[PDB]
Design an enzyme around this catalytic site. Structure first.
Site, PDB file in Angstrom:
ATOM      1  N   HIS A 145      13.050  70.526  48.039  1.00  0.00           N
ATOM      2  CA  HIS A 145      11.677  70.940  48.344  1.00  0.00           C
ATOM      3  C   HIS A 145      11.032  71.697  47.207  1.00  0.00           C
ATOM      4  O   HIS A 145      11.707  72.292  46.377  1.00  0.00           O
ATOM      5  CB  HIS A 145      11.612  71.784  49.645  1.00  0.00           C
ATOM      6  CG  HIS A 145      12.344  73.094  49.572  1.00  0.00           C
ATOM      7  ND1 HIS A 145      11.774  74.240  49.060  1.00  0.00           N
ATOM      8  CD2 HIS A 145      13.589  73.448  49.989  1.00  0.00           C
ATOM      9  CE1 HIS A 145      12.645  75.232  49.131  1.00  0.00           C
ATOM     10  NE2 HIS A 145      13.758  74.780  49.689  1.00  0.00           N
ATOM     11  N   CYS A 146       9.707  71.679  47.180  1.00  0.00           N
ATOM     12  CA  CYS A 146       8.967  72.509  46.245  1.00  0.00           C
ATOM     13  C   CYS A 146       9.057  73.974  46.700  1.00  0.00           C
ATOM     14  O   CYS A 146       9.167  74.254  47.895  1.00  0.00           O
ATOM     15  CB  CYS A 146       7.523  72.050  46.220  1.00  0.00           C
ATOM     16  SG  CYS A 146       6.494  72.958  45.078  1.00  0.00           S
ATOM     17  N   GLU A 165      25.917  63.850  71.946  1.00  0.00           N
ATOM     18  CA  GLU A 165      24.690  63.507  72.671  1.00  0.00           C
ATOM     19  C   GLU A 165      23.480  64.003  71.862  1.00  0.00           C
ATOM     20  O   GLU A 165      22.542  63.248  71.580  1.00  0.00           O
ATOM     21  CB  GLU A 165      24.704  64.072  74.103  1.00  0.00           C
ATOM     22  CG  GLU A 165      24.608  65.613  74.220  1.00  0.00           C
ATOM     23  CD  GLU A 165      24.728  66.108  75.661  1.00  0.00           C
ATOM     24  OE1 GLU A 165      23.950  65.676  76.535  1.00  0.00           O
ATOM     25  OE2 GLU A 165      25.614  66.946  75.915  1.00  0.00           O
ATOM     26  N   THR A 166      23.542  65.256  71.434  1.00  0.00           N
ATOM     27  CA  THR A 166      22.443  65.902  70.731  1.00  0.00           C
ATOM     28  C   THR A 166      23.092  66.790  69.673  1.00  0.00           C
ATOM     29  O   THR A 166      23.994  67.571  69.987  1.00  0.00           O
ATOM     30  CB  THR A 166      21.589  66.762  71.683  1.00  0.00           C
ATOM     31  OG1 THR A 166      21.005  65.925  72.693  1.00  0.00           O
ATOM     32  CG2 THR A 166      20.459  67.494  70.919  1.00  0.00           C
ATOM     33  N   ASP A 198      13.284  72.257  44.023  1.00  0.00           N
ATOM     34  CA  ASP A 198      14.541  72.934  44.305  1.00  0.00           C
ATOM     35  C   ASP A 198      15.398  71.916  45.047  1.00  0.00           C
ATOM     36  O   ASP A 198      15.021  71.453  46.130  1.00  0.00           O
ATOM     37  CB  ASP A 198      14.231  74.164  45.184  1.00  0.00           C
ATOM     38  CG  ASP A 198      15.463  74.819  45.782  1.00  0.00           C
ATOM     39  OD1 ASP A 198      15.310  75.959  46.268  1.00  0.00           O
ATOM     40  OD2 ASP A 198      16.568  74.229  45.777  1.00  0.00           O
ATOM     41  N   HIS A 258      18.739  71.557  47.016  1.00  0.00           N
ATOM     42  CA  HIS A 258      19.859  72.273  47.637  1.00  0.00           C
ATOM     43  C   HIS A 258      21.230  71.742  47.180  1.00  0.00           C
ATOM     44  O   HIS A 258      22.236  72.437  47.312  1.00  0.00           O
ATOM     45  CB  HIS A 258      19.772  72.200  49.162  1.00  0.00           C
ATOM     46  CG  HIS A 258      18.684  73.043  49.762  1.00  0.00           C
ATOM     47  ND1 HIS A 258      18.546  73.200  51.125  1.00  0.00           N
ATOM     48  CD2 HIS A 258      17.704  73.788  49.195  1.00  0.00           C
ATOM     49  CE1 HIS A 258      17.516  73.995  51.371  1.00  0.00           C
ATOM     50  NE2 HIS A 258      16.990  74.370  50.219  1.00  0.00           N
ATOM     51  N   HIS A 269      18.486  63.443  68.726  1.00  0.00           N
ATOM     52  CA  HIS A 269      19.095  62.767  69.856  1.00  0.00           C
ATOM     53  C   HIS A 269      18.584  61.334  69.877  1.00  0.00           C
ATOM     54  O   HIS A 269      17.384  61.092  69.826  1.00  0.00           O
ATOM     55  CB  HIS A 269      18.705  63.465  71.165  1.00  0.00           C
ATOM     56  CG  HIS A 269      19.268  62.798  72.377  1.00  0.00           C
ATOM     57  ND1 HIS A 269      20.348  63.301  73.064  1.00  0.00           N
ATOM     58  CD2 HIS A 269      18.929  61.646  72.999  1.00  0.00           C
ATOM     59  CE1 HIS A 269      20.646  62.492  74.067  1.00  0.00           C
ATOM     60  NE2 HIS A 269      19.804  61.477  74.047  1.00  0.00           N
ATOM     61  N   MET A 293       5.888  69.128  51.311  1.00  0.00           N
ATOM     62  CA  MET A 293       6.517  68.973  50.001  1.00  0.00           C
ATOM     63  C   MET A 293       8.036  69.146  50.045  1.00  0.00           C
ATOM     64  O   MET A 293       8.602  70.089  49.485  1.00  0.00           O
ATOM     65  CB  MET A 293       5.846  69.875  48.950  1.00  0.00           C
ATOM     66  CG  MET A 293       6.019  69.341  47.539  1.00  0.00           C
ATOM     67  SD  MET A 293       4.779  69.933  46.354  1.00  0.00           S
ATOM     68  CE  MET A 293       5.448  69.141  44.910  1.00  0.00           C
ATOM     69  N   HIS A 351       3.530  73.021  40.875  1.00  0.00           N
ATOM     70  CA  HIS A 351       4.619  72.607  41.750  1.00  0.00           C
ATOM     71  C   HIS A 351       5.928  72.667  40.997  1.00  0.00           C
ATOM     72  O   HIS A 351       5.947  72.781  39.774  1.00  0.00           O
ATOM     73  CB  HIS A 351       4.382  71.179  42.239  1.00  0.00           C
ATOM     74  CG  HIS A 351       3.101  71.006  42.994  1.00  0.00           C
ATOM     75  ND1 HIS A 351       2.963  71.353  44.322  1.00  0.00           N
ATOM     76  CD2 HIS A 351       1.895  70.522  42.606  1.00  0.00           C
ATOM     77  CE1 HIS A 351       1.730  71.094  44.720  1.00  0.00           C
ATOM     78  NE2 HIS A 351       1.064  70.588  43.696  1.00  0.00           N
ATOM     79  N   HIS A 378      15.241  66.955  70.483  1.00  0.00           N
ATOM     80  CA  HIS A 378      15.413  67.111  71.931  1.00  0.00           C
ATOM     81  C   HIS A 378      14.958  68.461  72.518  1.00  0.00           C
ATOM     82  O   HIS A 378      15.393  68.862  73.599  1.00  0.00           O
ATOM     83  CB  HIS A 378      16.841  66.699  72.405  1.00  0.00           C
ATOM     84  CG  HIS A 378      16.891  66.154  73.812  1.00  0.00           C
ATOM     85  ND1 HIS A 378      16.588  66.922  74.920  1.00  0.00           N
ATOM     86  CD2 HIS A 378      17.206  64.920  74.290  1.00  0.00           C
ATOM     87  CE1 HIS A 378      16.725  66.187  76.016  1.00  0.00           C
ATOM     88  NE2 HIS A 378      17.105  64.970  75.665  1.00  0.00           N
ATOM     89  N   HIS A 426       3.910  75.379  50.485  1.00  0.00           N
ATOM     90  CA  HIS A 426       4.182  74.043  49.936  1.00  0.00           C
ATOM     91  C   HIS A 426       5.121  73.255  50.830  1.00  0.00           C
ATOM     92  O   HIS A 426       4.906  72.065  51.080  1.00  0.00           O
ATOM     93  CB  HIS A 426       4.717  74.122  48.511  1.00  0.00           C
ATOM     94  CG  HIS A 426       3.660  74.477  47.516  1.00  0.00           C
ATOM     95  ND1 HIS A 426       3.345  73.681  46.431  1.00  0.00           N
ATOM     96  CD2 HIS A 426       2.814  75.534  47.471  1.00  0.00           C
ATOM     97  CE1 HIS A 426       2.351  74.242  45.761  1.00  0.00           C
ATOM     98  NE2 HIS A 426       2.018  75.369  46.365  1.00  0.00           N
TER      99      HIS A 426
END
Ligand SMILES: O=N[O-]
Ligand SMILES: [Cu+2]
Ligand SMILES: [Cu+2]
Ligand SMILES: [Cu+2]
Ligand SMILES: [Cu+]
Ligand SMILES: [Cu+]
Ligand SMILES: [Cu+]
Lengths: 337, 336, 336
Positions: free
Chosen positions: C132-133, C276-277, C95, C97, C252, C147, C92, C303, C142
């Site tokens: 995330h892996c 709203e969304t 990363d 971001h 939402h 993950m 494993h 939604h 993964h």
């Protein structure tokens, strides 16, 4: 505001009109807050959704898919009388994304066949907003049976661009986009059913694929074409309100643009400008403002072109006026090399 | 402008370059409005799109998938000569999302094999914009056969941030992302066809599932990886124009960011900043501006990672320069 | 900053907590830049994701899906000790971001079972970010095994609206949304396996359909309901951080709104208002700020209502306080 103050406000009863048209309203609010009254009867009805005669047991606010657009101004109260006639078979309700509390009103409007209810809410936030039925345990089935629409809450001062300049439309259309999930037989032909309930299990299977069989405006493939095409003229300013209560869409005016697009649908969020294709996530409405500059036929589409041209999500505009060769000209028409 | 004023504008012919490269241009406009002339020949040809020999009957502007990036400035005119050789078997046209009228130009440019056409339009709006073929009644089929590209209409004063500071790139790449829908036989093997039309019915069946078999950059799995990775250096400013004519994408520079992203692709809409992953809806182009800060290999992906790493939507950047331990360091290397 | 400058900075050890809760932190930075220390052990474990007993071989940062939310401030350093116990079977890595270089840290953190690593990066950009892996050649597998998680890099002055007004939350919750791809047998029954590798081939087949069998919050259908319903009171300001490392979502709050939404997750990009969304593309995190105005049960959903109510993407809030009849009232309760 107190109960007494709300009771003292003017009432205005509105007669709804069928999409894509919108009931008479004023862009800039006339006077102070009012209680704006609407009535809708829910109709469970068989509708035909394509030229082949494919049927859906629709669940339709005011008898249409989408349900009609309700228009109020910010800080008005929207007071809806919702009626579920005894001829229907299911319980229904209404969730206004514009409203605050009780799941948008759904918690307070659960009506069995033969019942009615009256819901009032304060339209605190300006924008276009989805509304839809949402019976606990049966939510997406009602929505994808067409039981959804939108409202517009205009700012009291009407629309403005991101920089405080007034934007006044000449006309407005409401395009409701519907994803349908119609069961097929072993030959791949669409099935028909006697009652709404008979379609439930087969329909849920299709829903679970997350792949609609039809994606349509105003309830059917080609509904906004021919003598039902939308109309405009060169120089005319048009607002196009677009909703999708369940699934993403990406509206595009083929041959035009969205000059100002409230892609989130909310008027206090500055609009994007000069848009080719905008994006409205499932569960929202958006609005695009455009001044037409060229005459002729336009297509207005969801720009997943498979969805537009294979699944049904294409409408037309017919536009009158003079051709502008500065903007575009055929220097050499198709001709032999 | 008046008729005489339009006629008096200079005309300039520009030679195109295959993606991901972009023809020479100036970021700030040189002189007043111009009629910028391009020519593209349409090629119908079989292409191989993966490591298993899977074929597509490509319909390719200028012979490439995507079609090349054409660059002009706001209020220039773009004047395209489009040629459909008599060796082709389908009618084609062109719709510029940048253009106003006649379905983006499609209504004026329907050319049968053995025909050509010249379309002029005024580039009134700044941004990156999709263009694609769109023969009425066969629109998505041409588009998902790779018949799409993009243009960039730069502001006359070049790019700026949301506060008016100039943003000047050192280089620009054009990544065109293509969803393909290749039919398979009942054993799961991709089918091959003699002529493009032979594949029509089977292809539309795949299209209607809304599930591409391949999602690729520059027309094939791995087209922008390995020895065809894009390049940069630490300190270099890079504009990455990305288009998808039919289907949503969510670009991400793995190891980097979009410092400024015109996610809608339109330069009068202020750019988002510090982006991890941006979103470009089907039917649009977007553009991301980044200054590279670390050397090494980057991947540039559609961040549905299944689309990226199972279906083909992954590119690389190879970046030279000095490692910056302030930004990132291995305090303890992998150890037992 | 130089190595010496970094070595002189205060250190702070953080104890992580299981989502949707968030570890103790300050909204406005306490003092100058620090090196903020975190430790996570990776657990390969079976999770049950629905009421039918459906199992996933989870690959879980800190033993949970999603992994926990790490909170720092802009220009702090995040120093993660990542441990792959000998009880696991796969390599494993991680990363971020939020990070710059070496594929977000993945290139420097590849640990076999029985290994550990320590990565330090500078949190230069404010926002919520996916982590995330991503093991080369096995990335989406993964990620869709759970993950992934997120971090929040707060501005040193805490949150503000688009016009510089301070936005201070009372509560914060982290909703990690997960698309799962569970194989089925000939009768449509979900398959079970006795090791993660056993499930690989079958799972990849489902992944390639791009159609998740389940879309869930906090690792399971109904996870953030009942005993795990999120709570608030009328008047309380709540920040909801939402991530999706692989696939788009559209959050939402049913009965509420996103008063301020950093839809892109990045705090230097002004928030949308009155939402709203909202929309979060696969590979990103977003954050919504809301002040509760009504008591009662709220649902918080993706939604696409099929994803929410057929596939599992629905959470609840339980909110205490006084009902506001000005905002909403039943003029006539359901009646004959
Ligand atoms: O803009 N033509 O799809
Ligand atoms: Cu809703
Ligand atoms: Cu188009
Ligand atoms: Cu990633
Ligand atoms: Cu209903
Ligand atoms: Cu074509
Ligand atoms: Cu892993």
């Amino acid at each position: 505001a107190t109960a007494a103050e709300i009771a003292a406000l003017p009432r205005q009863k509105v007669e709804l009109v069928d999409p894509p048209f919108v009931h008479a309203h004023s862009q800039v609010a006339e006077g102070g807050p009012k209680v704006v009254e609407f009535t809708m009867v829910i109709e469970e009805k068989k509708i035909v959704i394509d030229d082949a005669g494919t049927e859906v047991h629709a669940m339709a606010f005011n008898g249409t898919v989408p349900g009609p657009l309700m228009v109020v101004h910010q800080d008005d109260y929207l007071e809806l009388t919702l009626i579920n006639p005894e001829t229907n078979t299911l319980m229904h309700n209404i969730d206004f994304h514009a409203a605050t509390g009780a799941l948008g009103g759904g918690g307070l409007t659960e009506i069995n066949p033969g019942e009615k209810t009256i819901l009032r809410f304060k339209a605190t936030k300006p924008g276009v907003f989805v509304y839809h039925c949402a019976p606990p345990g049966m939510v997406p089935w009602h929505v994808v049976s067409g039981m959804n629409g939108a409202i517009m809450v205009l700012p009291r001062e009407g629309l403005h661009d991101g920089k405080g300049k007034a934007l006044t439309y000449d006309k407005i259309y409401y395009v409701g986009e519907q994803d349908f999930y119609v069961p097929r037989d072993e030959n791949g032909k669409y099935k028909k059913y006697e009652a709404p309930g008979d379609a439930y299990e087969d329909t849920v299977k299709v829903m679970r694929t997350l792949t609609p069989t039809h994606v349509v405006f105003n309830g059917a493939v080609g509904a906004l074409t021919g003598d039902k095409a939308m109309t405009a003229a060169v120089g005319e300013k048009v607002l196009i309100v677009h909703s999708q209560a369940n699934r993403d869409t990406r509206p595009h005016l083929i041959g035009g643009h969205g000059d100002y697009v409230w892609a989130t649908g909310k008027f206090n969020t500055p609009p994007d400008v000069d848009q080719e294709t905008w994006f409205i996530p499932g569960g929202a409405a958006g609005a695009a403002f455009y001044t037409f500059q060229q005459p002729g036929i336009y297509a207005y589409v969801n720009h997943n072109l498979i969805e537009a041209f294979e699944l049904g999500a294409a409408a037309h505009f017919k536009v009158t006026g003079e051709w502008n060769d500065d903007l575009m000209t055929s220097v050499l028409a198709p001709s032999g090399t």
